[PDB]
């Protein structure tokens, strides 16, 4: 649904690096170089950000509003 704040394995703060990651996707950066520039050395945070699906906007499209 939404990006988790904490990483499951280590616990590094990763929720604040989601939208900026999207910006790196709006830019010309690929996945690997963007994850490297974000400061994710260990592969657990890379899996957390890469394998995450942004379903919050799809649900808000069905929100009452």
């Amino acid at each position: 649904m939404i990006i988790p704040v904490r990483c499951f394995t280590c616990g590094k703060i990763v929720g604040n690096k989601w939208e900026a990651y999207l910006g790196l996707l709006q830019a010309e950066y690929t996945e690997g170089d963007a994850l490297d520039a974000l400061g994710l050395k260990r592969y657990c945070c890379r899996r957390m950000l890469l394998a995450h699906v942004d379903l919050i906007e799809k649900l808000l499209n069905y929100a009452p509003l």
Binding site: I2, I3, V5, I13, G15, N16, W18, E19, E57
Partner: protein, 49 residues
């Protein structure tokens, strides 16, 4: 109240649509306001969605 006709991006259409942790306001209790200076008690990253 002021936006473009299309405004496809949610940033222009809506305001405060993403509740970041910066909106958190520390409410002092008792004498915590005097002991802790302003700006010390706050979220760490200030950008967590």
């Amino acid at each position: 109240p002021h936006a473009a006709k299309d405004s496809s991006d949610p940033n222009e259409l809506y305001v405060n649509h993403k509740v970041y942790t910066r909106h958190m306001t520390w409410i002092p209790l008792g004498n915590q306001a005097d002991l802790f200076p302003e700006g010390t008690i706050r979220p760490v990253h200030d950008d967590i969605l």
